[PDB]
PDB file of C-alpha atoms in Angstrom:
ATOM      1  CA  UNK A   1      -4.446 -19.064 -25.021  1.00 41.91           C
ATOM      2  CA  UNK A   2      -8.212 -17.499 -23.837  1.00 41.00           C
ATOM      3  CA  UNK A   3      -9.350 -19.246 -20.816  1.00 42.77           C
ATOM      4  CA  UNK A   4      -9.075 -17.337 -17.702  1.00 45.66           C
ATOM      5  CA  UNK A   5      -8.555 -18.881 -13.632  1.00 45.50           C
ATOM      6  CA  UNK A   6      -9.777 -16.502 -11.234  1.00 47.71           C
ATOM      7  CA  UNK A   7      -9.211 -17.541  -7.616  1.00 47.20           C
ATOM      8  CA  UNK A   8      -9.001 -16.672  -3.444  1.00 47.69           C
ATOM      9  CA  UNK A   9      -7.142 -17.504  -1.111  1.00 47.29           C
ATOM     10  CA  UNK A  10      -8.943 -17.571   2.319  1.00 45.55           C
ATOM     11  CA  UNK A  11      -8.475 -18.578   6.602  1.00 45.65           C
ATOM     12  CA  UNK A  12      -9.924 -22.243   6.859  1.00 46.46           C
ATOM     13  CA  UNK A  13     -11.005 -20.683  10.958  1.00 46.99           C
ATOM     14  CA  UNK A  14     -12.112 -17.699   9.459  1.00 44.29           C
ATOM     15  CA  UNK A  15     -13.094 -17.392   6.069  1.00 39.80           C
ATOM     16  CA  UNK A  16     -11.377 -13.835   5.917  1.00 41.01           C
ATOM     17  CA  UNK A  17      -9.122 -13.310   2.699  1.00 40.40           C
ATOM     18  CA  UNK A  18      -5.221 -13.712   3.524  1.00 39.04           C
ATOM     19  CA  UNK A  19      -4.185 -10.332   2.815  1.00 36.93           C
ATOM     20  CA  UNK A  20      -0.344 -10.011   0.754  1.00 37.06           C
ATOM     21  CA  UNK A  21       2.293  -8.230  -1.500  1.00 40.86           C
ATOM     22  CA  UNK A  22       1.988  -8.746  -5.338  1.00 38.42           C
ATOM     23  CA  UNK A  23       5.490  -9.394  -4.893  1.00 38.37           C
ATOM     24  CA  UNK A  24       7.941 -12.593  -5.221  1.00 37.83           C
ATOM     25  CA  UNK A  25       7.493 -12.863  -1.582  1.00 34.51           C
ATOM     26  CA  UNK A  26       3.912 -13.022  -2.063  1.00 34.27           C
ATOM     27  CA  UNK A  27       1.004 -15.717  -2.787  1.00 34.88           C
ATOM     28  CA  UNK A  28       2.387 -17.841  -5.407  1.00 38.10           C
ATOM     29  CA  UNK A  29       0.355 -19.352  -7.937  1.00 39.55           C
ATOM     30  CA  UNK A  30       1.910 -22.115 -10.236  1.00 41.44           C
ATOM     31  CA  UNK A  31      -0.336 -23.406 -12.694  1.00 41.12           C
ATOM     32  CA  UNK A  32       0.981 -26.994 -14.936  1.00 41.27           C
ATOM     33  CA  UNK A  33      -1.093 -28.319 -17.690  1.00 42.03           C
ATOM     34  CA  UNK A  34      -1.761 -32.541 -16.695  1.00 44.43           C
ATOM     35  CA  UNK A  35      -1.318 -34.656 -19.575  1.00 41.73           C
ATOM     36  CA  UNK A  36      -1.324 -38.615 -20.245  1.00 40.04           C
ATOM     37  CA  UNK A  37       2.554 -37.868 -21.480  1.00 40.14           C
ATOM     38  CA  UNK A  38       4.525 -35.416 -18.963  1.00 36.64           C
ATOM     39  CA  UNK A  39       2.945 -32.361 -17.530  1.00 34.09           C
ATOM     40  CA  UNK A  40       3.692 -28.474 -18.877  1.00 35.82           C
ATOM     41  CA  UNK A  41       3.932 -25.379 -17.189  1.00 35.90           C
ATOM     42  CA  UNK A  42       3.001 -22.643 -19.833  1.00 38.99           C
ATOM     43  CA  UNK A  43       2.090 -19.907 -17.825  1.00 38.62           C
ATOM     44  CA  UNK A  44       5.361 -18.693 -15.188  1.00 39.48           C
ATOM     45  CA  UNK A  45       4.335 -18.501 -11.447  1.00 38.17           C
ATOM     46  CA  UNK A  46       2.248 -15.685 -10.979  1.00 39.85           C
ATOM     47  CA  UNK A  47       1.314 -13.530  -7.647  1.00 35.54           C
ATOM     48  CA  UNK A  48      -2.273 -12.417  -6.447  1.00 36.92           C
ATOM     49  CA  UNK A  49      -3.131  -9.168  -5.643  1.00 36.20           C
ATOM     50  CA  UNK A  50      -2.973  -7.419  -2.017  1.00 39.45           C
ATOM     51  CA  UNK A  51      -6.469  -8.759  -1.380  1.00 39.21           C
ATOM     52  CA  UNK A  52      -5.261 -12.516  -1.971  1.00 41.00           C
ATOM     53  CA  UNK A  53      -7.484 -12.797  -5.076  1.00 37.49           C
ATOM     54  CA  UNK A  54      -5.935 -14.021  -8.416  1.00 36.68           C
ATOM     55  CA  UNK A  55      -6.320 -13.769 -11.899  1.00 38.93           C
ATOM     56  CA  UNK A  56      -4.552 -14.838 -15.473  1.00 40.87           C
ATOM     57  CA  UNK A  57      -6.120 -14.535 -18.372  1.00 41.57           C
ATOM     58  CA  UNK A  58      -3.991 -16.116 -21.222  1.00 37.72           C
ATOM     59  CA  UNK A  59      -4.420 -19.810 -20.242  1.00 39.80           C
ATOM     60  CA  UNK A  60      -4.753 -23.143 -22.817  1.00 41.29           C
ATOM     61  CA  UNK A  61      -7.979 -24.926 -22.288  1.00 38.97           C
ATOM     62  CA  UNK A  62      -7.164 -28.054 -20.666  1.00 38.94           C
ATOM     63  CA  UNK A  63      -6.754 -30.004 -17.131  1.00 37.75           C
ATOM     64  CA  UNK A  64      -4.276 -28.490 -14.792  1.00 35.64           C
ATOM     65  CA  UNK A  65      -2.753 -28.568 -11.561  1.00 33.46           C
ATOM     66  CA  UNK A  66      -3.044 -25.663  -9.502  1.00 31.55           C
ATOM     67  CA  UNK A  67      -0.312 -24.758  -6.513  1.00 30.31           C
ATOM     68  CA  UNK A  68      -0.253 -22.299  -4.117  1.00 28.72           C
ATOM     69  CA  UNK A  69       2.372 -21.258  -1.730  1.00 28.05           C
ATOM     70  CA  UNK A  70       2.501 -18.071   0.880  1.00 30.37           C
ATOM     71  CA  UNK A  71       2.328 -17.230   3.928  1.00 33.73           C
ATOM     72  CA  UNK A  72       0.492 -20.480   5.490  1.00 33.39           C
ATOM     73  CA  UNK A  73       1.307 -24.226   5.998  1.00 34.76           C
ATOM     74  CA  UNK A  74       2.303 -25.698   2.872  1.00 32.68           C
ATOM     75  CA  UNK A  75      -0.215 -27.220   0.793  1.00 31.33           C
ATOM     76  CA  UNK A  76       2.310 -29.797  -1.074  1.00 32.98           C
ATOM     77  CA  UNK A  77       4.199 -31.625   1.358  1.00 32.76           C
ATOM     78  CA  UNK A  78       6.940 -33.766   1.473  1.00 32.01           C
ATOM     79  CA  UNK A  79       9.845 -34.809   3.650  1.00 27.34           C
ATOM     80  CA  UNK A  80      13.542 -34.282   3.592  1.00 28.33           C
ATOM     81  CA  UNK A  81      14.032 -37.649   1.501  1.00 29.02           C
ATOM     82  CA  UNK A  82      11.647 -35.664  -0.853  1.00 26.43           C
ATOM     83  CA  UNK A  83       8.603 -38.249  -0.310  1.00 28.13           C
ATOM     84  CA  UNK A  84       5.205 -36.921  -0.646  1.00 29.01           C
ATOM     85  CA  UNK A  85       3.051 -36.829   2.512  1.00 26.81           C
ATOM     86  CA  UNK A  86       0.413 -34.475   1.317  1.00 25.34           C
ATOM     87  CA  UNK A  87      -0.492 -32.541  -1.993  1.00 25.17           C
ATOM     88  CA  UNK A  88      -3.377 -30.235  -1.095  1.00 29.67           C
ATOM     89  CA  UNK A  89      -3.070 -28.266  -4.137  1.00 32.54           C
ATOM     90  CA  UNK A  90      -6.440 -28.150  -7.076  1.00 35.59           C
ATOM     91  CA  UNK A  91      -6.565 -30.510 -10.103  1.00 39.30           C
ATOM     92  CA  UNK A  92      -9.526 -28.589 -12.132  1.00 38.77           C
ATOM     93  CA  UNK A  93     -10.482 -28.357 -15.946  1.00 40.48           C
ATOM     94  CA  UNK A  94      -9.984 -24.578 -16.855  1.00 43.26           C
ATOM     95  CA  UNK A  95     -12.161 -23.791 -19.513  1.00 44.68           C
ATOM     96  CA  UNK A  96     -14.002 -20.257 -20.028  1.00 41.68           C
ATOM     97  CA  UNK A  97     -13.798 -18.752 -16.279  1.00 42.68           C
ATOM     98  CA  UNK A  98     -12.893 -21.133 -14.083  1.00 41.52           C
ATOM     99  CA  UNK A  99     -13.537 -19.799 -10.439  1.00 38.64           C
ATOM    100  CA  UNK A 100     -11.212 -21.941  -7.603  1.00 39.74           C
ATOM    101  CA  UNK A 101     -11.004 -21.097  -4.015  1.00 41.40           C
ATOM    102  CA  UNK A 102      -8.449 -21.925  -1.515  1.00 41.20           C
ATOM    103  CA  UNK A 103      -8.720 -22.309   2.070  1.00 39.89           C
ATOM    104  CA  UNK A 104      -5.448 -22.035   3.973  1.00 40.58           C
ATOM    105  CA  UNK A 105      -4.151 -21.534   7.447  1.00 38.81           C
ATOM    106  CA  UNK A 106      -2.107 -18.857   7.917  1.00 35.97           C
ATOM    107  CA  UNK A 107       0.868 -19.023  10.274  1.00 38.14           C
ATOM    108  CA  UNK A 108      -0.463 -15.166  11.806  1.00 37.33           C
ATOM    109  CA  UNK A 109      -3.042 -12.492  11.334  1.00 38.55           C
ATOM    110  CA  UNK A 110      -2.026  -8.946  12.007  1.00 39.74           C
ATOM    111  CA  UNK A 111      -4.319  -6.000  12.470  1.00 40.10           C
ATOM    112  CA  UNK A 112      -3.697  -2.415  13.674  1.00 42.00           C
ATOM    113  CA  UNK A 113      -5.906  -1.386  16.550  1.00 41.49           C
ATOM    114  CA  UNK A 114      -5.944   2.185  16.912  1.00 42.14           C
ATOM    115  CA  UNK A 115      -6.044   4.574  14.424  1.00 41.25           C
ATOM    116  CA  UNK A 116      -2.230   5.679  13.532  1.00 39.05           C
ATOM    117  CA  UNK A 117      -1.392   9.196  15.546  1.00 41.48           C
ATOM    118  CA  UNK A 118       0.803  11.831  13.723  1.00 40.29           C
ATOM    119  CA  UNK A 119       3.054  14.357  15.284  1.00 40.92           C
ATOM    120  CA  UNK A 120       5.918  16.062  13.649  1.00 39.28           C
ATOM    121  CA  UNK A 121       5.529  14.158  10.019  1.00 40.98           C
ATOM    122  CA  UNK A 122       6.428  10.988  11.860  1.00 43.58           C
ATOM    123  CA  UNK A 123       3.483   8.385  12.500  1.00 39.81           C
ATOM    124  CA  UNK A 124       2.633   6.166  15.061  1.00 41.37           C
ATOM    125  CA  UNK A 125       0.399   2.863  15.373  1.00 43.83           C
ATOM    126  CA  UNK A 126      -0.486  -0.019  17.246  1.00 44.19           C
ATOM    127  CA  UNK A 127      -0.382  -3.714  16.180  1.00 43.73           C
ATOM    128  CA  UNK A 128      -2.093  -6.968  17.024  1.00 42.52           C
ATOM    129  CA  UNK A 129      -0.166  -9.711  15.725  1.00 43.86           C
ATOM    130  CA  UNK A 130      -1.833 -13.078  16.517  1.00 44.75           C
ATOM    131  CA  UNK A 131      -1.402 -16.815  15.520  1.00 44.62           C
ATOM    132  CA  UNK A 132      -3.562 -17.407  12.465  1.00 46.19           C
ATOM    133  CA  UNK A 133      -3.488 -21.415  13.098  1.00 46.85           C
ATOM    134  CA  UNK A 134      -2.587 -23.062  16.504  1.00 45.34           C
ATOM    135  CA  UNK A 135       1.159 -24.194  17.338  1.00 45.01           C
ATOM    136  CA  UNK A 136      -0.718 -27.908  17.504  1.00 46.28           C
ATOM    137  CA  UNK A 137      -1.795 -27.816  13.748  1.00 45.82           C
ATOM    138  CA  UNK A 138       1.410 -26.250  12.877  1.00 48.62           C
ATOM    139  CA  UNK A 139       3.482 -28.925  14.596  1.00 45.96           C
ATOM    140  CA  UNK A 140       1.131 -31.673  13.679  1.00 44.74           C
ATOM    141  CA  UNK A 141       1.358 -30.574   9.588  1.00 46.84           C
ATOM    142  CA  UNK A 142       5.278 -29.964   9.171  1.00 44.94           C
ATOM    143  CA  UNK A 143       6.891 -31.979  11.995  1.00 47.38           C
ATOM    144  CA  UNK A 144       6.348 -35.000   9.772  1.00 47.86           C
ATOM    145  CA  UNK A 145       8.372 -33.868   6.661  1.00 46.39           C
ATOM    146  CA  UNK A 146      11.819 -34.050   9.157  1.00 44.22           C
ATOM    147  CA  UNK A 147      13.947 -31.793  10.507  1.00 41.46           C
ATOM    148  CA  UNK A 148      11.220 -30.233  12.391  1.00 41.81           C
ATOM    149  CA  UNK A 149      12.716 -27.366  15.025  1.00 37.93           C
ATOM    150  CA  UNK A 150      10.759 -25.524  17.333  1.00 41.33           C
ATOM    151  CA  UNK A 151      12.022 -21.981  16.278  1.00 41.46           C
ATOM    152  CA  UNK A 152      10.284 -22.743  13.161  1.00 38.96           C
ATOM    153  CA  UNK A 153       7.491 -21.025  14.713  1.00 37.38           C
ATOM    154  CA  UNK A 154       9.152 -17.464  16.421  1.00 39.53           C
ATOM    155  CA  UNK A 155       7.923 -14.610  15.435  1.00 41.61           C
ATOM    156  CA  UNK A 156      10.759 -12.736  14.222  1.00 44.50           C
ATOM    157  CA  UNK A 157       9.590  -9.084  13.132  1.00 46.63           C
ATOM    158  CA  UNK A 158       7.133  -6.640  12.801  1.00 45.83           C
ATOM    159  CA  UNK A 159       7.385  -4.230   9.434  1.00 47.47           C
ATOM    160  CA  UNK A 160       5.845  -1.194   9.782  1.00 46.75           C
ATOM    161  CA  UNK A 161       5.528  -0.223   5.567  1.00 52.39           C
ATOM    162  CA  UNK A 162       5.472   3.240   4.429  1.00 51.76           C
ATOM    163  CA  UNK A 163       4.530   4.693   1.298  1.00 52.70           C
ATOM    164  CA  UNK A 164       2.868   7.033  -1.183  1.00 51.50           C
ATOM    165  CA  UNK A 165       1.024   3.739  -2.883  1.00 49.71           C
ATOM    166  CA  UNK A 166      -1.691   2.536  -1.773  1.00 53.51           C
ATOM    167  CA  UNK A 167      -0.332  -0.657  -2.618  1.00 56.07           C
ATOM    168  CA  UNK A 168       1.608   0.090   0.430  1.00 55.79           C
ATOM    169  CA  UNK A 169       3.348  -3.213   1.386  1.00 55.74           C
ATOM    170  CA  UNK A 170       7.062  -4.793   1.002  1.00 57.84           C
ATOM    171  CA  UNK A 171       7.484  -4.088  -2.526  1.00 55.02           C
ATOM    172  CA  UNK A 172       6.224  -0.320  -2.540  1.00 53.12           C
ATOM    173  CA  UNK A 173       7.459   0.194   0.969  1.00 52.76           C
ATOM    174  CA  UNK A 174       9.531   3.506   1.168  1.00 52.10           C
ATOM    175  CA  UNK A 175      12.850   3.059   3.186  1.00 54.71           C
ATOM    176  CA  UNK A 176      12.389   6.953   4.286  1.00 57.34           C
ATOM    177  CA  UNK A 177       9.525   6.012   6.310  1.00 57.07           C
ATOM    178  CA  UNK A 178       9.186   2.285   6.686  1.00 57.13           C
ATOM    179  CA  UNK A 179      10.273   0.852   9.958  1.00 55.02           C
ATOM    180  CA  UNK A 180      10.888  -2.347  12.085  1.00 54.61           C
ATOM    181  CA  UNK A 181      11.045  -3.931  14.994  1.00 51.98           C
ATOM    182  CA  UNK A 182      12.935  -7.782  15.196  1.00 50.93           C
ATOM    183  CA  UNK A 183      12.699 -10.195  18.206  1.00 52.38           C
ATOM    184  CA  UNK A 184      15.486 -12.366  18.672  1.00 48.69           C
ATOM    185  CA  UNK A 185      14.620 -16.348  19.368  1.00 47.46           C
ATOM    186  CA  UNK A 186      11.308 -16.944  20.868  1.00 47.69           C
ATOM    187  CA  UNK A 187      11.035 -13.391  22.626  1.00 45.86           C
ATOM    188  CA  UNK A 188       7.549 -12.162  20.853  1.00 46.06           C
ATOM    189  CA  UNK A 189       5.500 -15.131  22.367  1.00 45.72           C
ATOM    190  CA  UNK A 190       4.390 -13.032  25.352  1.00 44.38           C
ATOM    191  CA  UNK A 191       3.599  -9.618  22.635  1.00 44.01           C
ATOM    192  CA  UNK A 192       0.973 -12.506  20.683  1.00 42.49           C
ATOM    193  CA  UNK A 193      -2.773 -10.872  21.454  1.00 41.19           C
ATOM    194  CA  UNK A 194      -1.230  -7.589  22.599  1.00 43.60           C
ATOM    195  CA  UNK A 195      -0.768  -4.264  21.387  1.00 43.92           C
ATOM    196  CA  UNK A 196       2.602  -3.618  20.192  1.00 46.52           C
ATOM    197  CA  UNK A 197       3.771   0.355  19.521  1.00 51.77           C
ATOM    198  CA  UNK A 198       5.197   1.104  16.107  1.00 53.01           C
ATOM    199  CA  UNK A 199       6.879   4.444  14.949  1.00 51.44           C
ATOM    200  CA  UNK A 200       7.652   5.707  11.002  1.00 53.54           C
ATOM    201  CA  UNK A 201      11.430   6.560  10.374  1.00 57.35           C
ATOM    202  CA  UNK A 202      12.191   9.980   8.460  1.00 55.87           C
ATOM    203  CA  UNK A 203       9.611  12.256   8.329  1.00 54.20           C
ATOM    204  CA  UNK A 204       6.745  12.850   5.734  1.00 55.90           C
ATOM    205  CA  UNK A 205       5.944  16.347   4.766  1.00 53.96           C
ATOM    206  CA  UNK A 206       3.275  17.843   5.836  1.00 52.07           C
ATOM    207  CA  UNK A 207       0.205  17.919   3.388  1.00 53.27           C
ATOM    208  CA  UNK A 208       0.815  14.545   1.764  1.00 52.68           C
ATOM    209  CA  UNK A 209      -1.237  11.521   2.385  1.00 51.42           C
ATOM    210  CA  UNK A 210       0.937   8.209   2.644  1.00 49.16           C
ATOM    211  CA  UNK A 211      -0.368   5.002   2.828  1.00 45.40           C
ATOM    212  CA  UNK A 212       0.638   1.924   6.163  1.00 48.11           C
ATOM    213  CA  UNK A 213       0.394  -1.465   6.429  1.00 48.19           C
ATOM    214  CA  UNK A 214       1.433  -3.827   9.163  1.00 49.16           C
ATOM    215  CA  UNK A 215       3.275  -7.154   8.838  1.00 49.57           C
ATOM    216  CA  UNK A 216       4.578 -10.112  11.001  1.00 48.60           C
ATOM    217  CA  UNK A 217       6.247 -13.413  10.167  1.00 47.52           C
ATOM    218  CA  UNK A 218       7.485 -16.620  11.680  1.00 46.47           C
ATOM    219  CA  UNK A 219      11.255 -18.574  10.835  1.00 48.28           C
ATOM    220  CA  UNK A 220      10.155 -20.291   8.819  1.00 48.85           C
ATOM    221  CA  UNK A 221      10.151 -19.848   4.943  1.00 48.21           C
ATOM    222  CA  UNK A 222       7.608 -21.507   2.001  1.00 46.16           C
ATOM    223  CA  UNK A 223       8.229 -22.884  -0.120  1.00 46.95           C
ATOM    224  CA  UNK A 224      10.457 -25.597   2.192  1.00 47.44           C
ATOM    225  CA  UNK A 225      14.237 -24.966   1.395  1.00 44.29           C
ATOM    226  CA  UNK A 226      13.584 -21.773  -0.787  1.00 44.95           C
ATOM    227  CA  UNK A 227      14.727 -19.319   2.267  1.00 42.69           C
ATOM    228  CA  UNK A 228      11.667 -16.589   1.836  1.00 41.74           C
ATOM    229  CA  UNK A 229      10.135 -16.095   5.116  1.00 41.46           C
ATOM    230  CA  UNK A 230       6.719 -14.843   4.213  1.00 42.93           C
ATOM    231  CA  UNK A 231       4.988 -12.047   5.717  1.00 40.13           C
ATOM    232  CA  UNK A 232       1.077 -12.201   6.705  1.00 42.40           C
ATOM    233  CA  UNK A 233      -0.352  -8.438   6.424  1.00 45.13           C
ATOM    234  CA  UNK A 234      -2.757  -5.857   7.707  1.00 44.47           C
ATOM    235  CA  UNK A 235      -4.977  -4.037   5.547  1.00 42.24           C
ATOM    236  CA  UNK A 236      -3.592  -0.908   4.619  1.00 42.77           C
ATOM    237  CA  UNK A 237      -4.612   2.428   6.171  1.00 42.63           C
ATOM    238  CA  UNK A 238      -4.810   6.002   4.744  1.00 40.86           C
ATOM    239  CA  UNK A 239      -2.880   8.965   7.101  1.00 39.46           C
ATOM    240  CA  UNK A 240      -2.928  12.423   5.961  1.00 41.20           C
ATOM    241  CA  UNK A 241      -0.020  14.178   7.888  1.00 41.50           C
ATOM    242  CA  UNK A 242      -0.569  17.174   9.658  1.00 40.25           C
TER     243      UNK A 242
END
């Protein structure tokens, strides 16, 4: 197999990348072969990169389906009798490089403001989390595939991941130094569009340069049913300690 897919994921509003984890709790990229018979998936789910860009290189020339899944509204959607409503996924030819580009809406976009402070080996930064597509589209999208709740959309935490990587982010998080805050029901509404202050656990020696990223996510997990509640991230940010 020598045809390579090479793809983004991107905000719809925006245009920015959707920042993630090369983890299982990452962007998801499934990619079946289409055939007159039934369809094949050769190559296993893969997961893009931190800066929501993907690449596999080991694919069989031929037509194929392309599905993403992550930390935005689903793409492929169907209801709890398991009837399709929407598939918003890619049908392309991949053949040489194929380039493919997804636009998404993520459920939030998180930023730090400041740059983090450090005192005493433990660090200190603030966070902007911020709906990445209105409650309106939200609602309007899922309520139709049933059992629809409004908690669906609380913000339930805010990670604060530590670590000597610089592909700081769930997966490389350190547990020394990585911290969190949760918000019980819909508690984090009024925080949305404000500053929020976050503080490292532990201490990191002084000298070393560690690497932190911030992340949010909503109660609600993708894909439907699977139980991963997906975290949209910050870039990451250098901080040598004092």
């Amino acid at each position: 197999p020598s045809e390579t897919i090479w793809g983004e994921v991107v905000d719809e509003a925006t245009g920015k990348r959707v920042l993630t984890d090369q983890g299982s709790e990452g962007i998801r990229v499934r990619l079946t072969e289409l055939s007159w018979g039934d369809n094949v998936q050769h190559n296993p789910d893969f997961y893009c990169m931190m800066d929501g860009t993907f690449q596999n290189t080991k694919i069989f020339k031929g037509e194929y389906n392309v599905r993403i899944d992550g930390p935005f509204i689903p793409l492929v959607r169907e209801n709890t009798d398991g009837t399709l409503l929407h598939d918003g996924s890619v049908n392309t030819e991949i053949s040489g490089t194929t380039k493919v580009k997804f636009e998404v809406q993520p459920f939030l976009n998180v930023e730090f403001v400041g740059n983090p402070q450090v005192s005493n080996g433990v660090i200190k930064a603030q966070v902007r989390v911020t709906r990445g597509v209105s409650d309106e589209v939200f609602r309007e999208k899922i309520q139709p595939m049933g059992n629809w709740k409004d908690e669906y959309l609380n913000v339930t935490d805010i990670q604060f991941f530590v670590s000597y990587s610089n592909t700081v982010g769930y997966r490389a998080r350190d547990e020394r130094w990585s911290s969190s805050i949760n918000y019980e029901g819909k508690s984090f509404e009024g925080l949305l569009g404000k500053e929020v202050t976050i503080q490292s656990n532990g201490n990191v020696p002084s000298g070393r340069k560690v690497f932190v990223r911030a992340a949010a996510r909503i109660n609600y997990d993708t894909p439907v049913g699977s139980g991963t509640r997906r975290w949209n991230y910050s870039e990451p940010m250098e901080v040598l300690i004092p």
